[PDB]
Write a protein that binds this ligand. Sequence first.
Ligand SMILES: CN[C@@H]1CCc2c(ccc(O)c2O)[C@H]1O
Length: 281
Amino acid sequence: VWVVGMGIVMSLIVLAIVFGNVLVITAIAKFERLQTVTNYFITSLACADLVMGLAVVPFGAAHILTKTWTFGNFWCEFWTSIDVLCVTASIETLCVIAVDRYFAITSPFKYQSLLTKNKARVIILMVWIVSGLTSFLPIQMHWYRATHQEAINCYAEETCCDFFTNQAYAIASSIVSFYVPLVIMVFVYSRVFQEAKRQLQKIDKSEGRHKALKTLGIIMGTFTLCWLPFFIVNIVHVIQDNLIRKEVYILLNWIGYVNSGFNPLIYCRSPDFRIAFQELL
Ligand SMILES: CN[C@@H]1CCc2c(ccc(O)c2O)[C@H]1O
């Protein structure tokens, strides 16, 4: 009786993700006032979220609700390659957002001419290619496979498609896709908050007669709660095999998948954007 118990939520999630992504993309597309150097970065985020939601989630639902795929093996590798690429692209885009916000706040005088409209696009390219260097190239090679006899019936046979990783690839992907962005964001937002506190103290000193905490905390809480637990167990299993079970791993991956739907509300709020949404429909 759980056939409809689990799966309707998946349909709701995918529909919500698609609807959220398409509105942001068309709002950037069709209105002139929205275009800016910052919005170009969010455009890649929206496109990547739309691609991932349209690609990996609906097919993953079939794998969840049935024993295994009715599909091919190269398609299994293709799905596994798309998922990691999407996740790492999202992480890198968020890191770039934090960096450019820091450049804006800290040194306004040089910011106006630091980031030209043209050169900005270049950095986005330097994101995706880097992601590709960890997404398609190692998956198509033998690095995705494992040496242990268990799951050989998965990699070297047709029906099974579950994920199995060698020791090196898991830790390398975790180091290159999660921890470096986090160690960037923590320090950079600490500096931004210190600057904001200093400014508020100066304003209070000027004229006798907390927004920043909430504003940064919503984003930090959403991101850290969404993605941190997965990349602990990701290192752990590979480090030690006995501890974890598969279903918990899948659930922690899925709760991270929800971040794609969760993000646009946190990372997109402006009166101009509100007017643009109001104009549509
Ligand atoms: C099947 N889902 C995959 C499995 C492993 C993995 C993911 C994302 C980023 C990585 O660096 C990974 O190693 C997950 O999205």
